[PDB]
Paper text:
We also determined the structures of filaments comprising two protofilaments of fold I, related by C2 symmetry. In all three folds, residues G177–N183 adopt a conserved conformation, with the positively charged residues K178 and R180 pointing outwards. In filaments made of two protofilaments with fold I, two pairs of these residues are on opposite sides of a contiguous extra density that runs along the helical symmetry axis. As the cofactor responsible for this density probably does not obey the imposed helical symmetry, the map in this region is of insufficient quality to allow its identification. In fold I, this region packs loosely against the other side of the C-terminal hairpin-like region with the formation of three large amphipathic cavities. Individuals with fold I were homozygous for T185 or S185, or heterozygous, indicating that fold I can accommodate a threonine or a serine at position 185. Filaments with fold I were more common than filaments with folds II or III.
Residue numbers in the entry:
A (entry chain B), B (entry chain C), C (entry chain A): 120 to 254
Write the structure that this text describes.
């Protein structure tokens, strides 16, 4: 990939930005741009390509075979009891979080037992992230 | 990929923006642009392509064979009991959250037992994310 | 990859930006730009390519065979009990967080038992991240 950008506030090719309480006076601005972009990208020129898979089983004897793909999750436990007991008392809770297995982004690609792949594969994340703000 | 951008506030090719309480006077702005973009992208030129899969089973004996794909989840347990007991007391809760297995974006592509693939695959995420904000 | 940039605030090719309480007077700005970009990227020129897979089982005897892919999670336990006991007392909680297995970005590509791959694979992450902010 090409030209992958995170810009926090402002993007220009040419900028003349005049901001705050300023005097901007008698200004002559002249601009003469030639800006051409030529892309030959992710391009393929092939006579033959072959993706061949063969399984042969002859006079074989097969017992108790297990094939298990990735991210097998077995007998996982989360135990998060919360207890408040009060007498003659005050609780003030502000912005209190209990957070279990919270996800923002999950991107999964070609997650398999078996893969035969030819060509291009791509993942991009661009992000402003804030979990907690309070005040 | 090409030209993948995250811009926080403003994007322009040429910008003459004037913001606040400013004086802009007698200004002469002149602009002459040539800006051409030429794209030959993800182009394919192929004479032959073959995706062959063959399974042959002769006088074989097969018993107890298990093929399990990815992300298999078994007997997972979440226990999150919340208990509040109060007498002659005061509870003030503001912005209190209990969050279990919360997802924003889940993208899954080519998640399989077996795969034969030729070409292009792509995942893009662009995001402004705030989980909690309070005051 | 090419031209992957993280810019915290402002991006320009040319900038004439005027900020705060300034006097900008009689300025003559003249600009002549020639800026052409030529990209021949991720380009392929091949006569033959072969992805061949063959499995042959003869007069063989197979028993108790287990094949397990990556990220296998078994009997994981999270125990996070929170207990507050109060009598004749005051509790003030501000911005209190309990966070268990919280994920932002999860990018997974080609996670497999077996893989045959030809070509390009790419992962890009650009991020402004704040977990907690409070006052």
């Amino acid at each position: 990939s090409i030209d992958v950008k995170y810009i926090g506030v402002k993007s220009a090719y040419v900028s003349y930005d005049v901001q705050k309480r300023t005097i901007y006076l008698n200004i002559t601005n002249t601009l003469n741009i030639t800006n051409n972009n030529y892309y030959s990208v992710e391009v393929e020129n092939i006579t033959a390509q072959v993706q061949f898979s063969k399984t042969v089983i002859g006079k074989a004897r097969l017992n108790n075979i297990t094939i298990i793909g990735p991210l097998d999750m077995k007998q996982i436990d989360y135990t998060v009891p919360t207890v408040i007991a009060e007498e003659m008392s005050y609780m003030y809770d502000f912005c209190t979080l209990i957070s279990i297995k919270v996800h923002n982004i999950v991107l999964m690609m070609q997650v398999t037992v078996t893969t035969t792949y030819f060509g291009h594969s791509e993942q991009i994340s661009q992000e402003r992230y804030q979990y907690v703000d309070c005040g």
